[PDB]
Amino acid sequence: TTTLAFRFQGGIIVAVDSRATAGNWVASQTVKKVIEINPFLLGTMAGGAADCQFWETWLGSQCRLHELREKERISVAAASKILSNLVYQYKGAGLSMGTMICGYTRKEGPTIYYVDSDGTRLKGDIFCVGSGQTFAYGVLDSNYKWDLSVEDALYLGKRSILAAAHRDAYSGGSVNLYHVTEDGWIYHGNHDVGELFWKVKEEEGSFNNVIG
């Protein structure tokens, strides 16, 4: 899978691919790897499909219970730590999860937390997760600056997933884009790689390795 999230001047960009595999069998090209926990919180999924879907859906329930009890939106820190403490209980049992918890709150500002199934929890500005993470990192790190336009940042996230979809055999299908602000997350569409690749090739003049 390839998933990424990064912080910049205008908030957070989150982009993921849509492929599910069973070994070399391509099980699906239409999976949703972003979960919308609330209007200010997003979760990304990489690893076991069931593990990710079940526990991130469960996380949504625990975040909802927090706001009923405390009359206040859960912090990104607290939400990420609920998931990391849960997987830590299951450590050694064989769960497979690589996730990013991305959101805005007034007290924290825009925040990204990496959480995985061996128990690691890390705050940071940039993360790429999954089988195709290295390919995304290659494009992302070279064109990254703090002060991209929202338009340029959305494109870079889209382009980094495209890069990984191309090179990584276990990533592909389509690109789902999100932008997180003060006012919440905004969906910026599903982009099929079968059309996007050729569009990007022509307009950008990239992918000169391919017969086009």
Binding site: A20, A27, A49, D51, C52, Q53, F54
Partner: protein
């Protein structure tokens, strides 16, 4: 050492139409190179206009269907005879499957029916409960043979408008029930030719607003 799992073969197929859905399965049941039965029903009416099949290890499949049928019964008791919607059925099945995350049900599950807007719905599950709604899904032994054909013929993948160079895709359409059943029958005839575990008979359950109807067709017995 004792192995608690087995492989009973078989293959299943769900297709969603505009105001209908089908769930088809072959009726052959096998172990190794033996035929256990030529007619052992694998697709089941579970009530509330929902059809289900859990293909793979038949004992786990039967157990799961039995537990879901019971879940529908207790949903009626606990919530004033309310109709279990297909989306709600799907989420319930995820919890049934993920409950045995560390000793899984060895099956690929498909359910079919109508959503709350009356539109055709097919949901698909892995052994430990990850799920997705789709227009198309094949599961089981000959899934690898059937799915690419469905991508091509139901979702019109890799097909373009003639004379447009290759820039206008074939536009997506809902298929009629007559057209879907033709694709189902050809899928299973093709799978039977090339997969040894597929054959004997084809049983299709069709779900509409009017209810659940059945159709049966002979398949090759070799």
């Amino acid at each position: 050492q004792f192995n608690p799992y087995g492989d009973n073969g078989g293959t299943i197929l769900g297709i969603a139409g505009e105001d209908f859905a089908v769930l088809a399965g072959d009726t052959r049941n096998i172990t190794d190179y033996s035929i256990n039965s030529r007619y052992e029903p694998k697709v089941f009416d579970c009530g509330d206009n929902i059809v289900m099949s859990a293909n793979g290890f038949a004992a786990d499949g039967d157990a799961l269907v039995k537990r879901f049928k019971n879940s529908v019964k207790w949903y009626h008791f606990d919530h004033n005879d309310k109709k279990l919607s297909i989306n709600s059925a799907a989420r319930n099945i995820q919890h049934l499957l993920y409950g045995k995350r560390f000793f899984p049900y060895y099956v690929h599950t498909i359910i079919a029916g109508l959503d709350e807007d009356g539109k055709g719905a097919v949901y698909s599950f892995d052994p430990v409960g990850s799920y997705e709604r789709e227009q198309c899904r094949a599961g089981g032994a000959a899934a690898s043979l059937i799915m690419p054909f469905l991508d091509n013929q139901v979702n019109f993948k890799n097909q373009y408008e003639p004379g447009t160079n290759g820039k206008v895709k074939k536009p997506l359409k809902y298929l009629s029930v007559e057209e879907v059943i033709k694709l189902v029958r050809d899928s299973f005839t093709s799978a039977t030719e090339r997969h040894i575990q597929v054959g004997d008979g084809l049983e299709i359950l069709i779900v509409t607003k009017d209810g659940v109807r059945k159709e049966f067709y002979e398949l090759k017995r070799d």
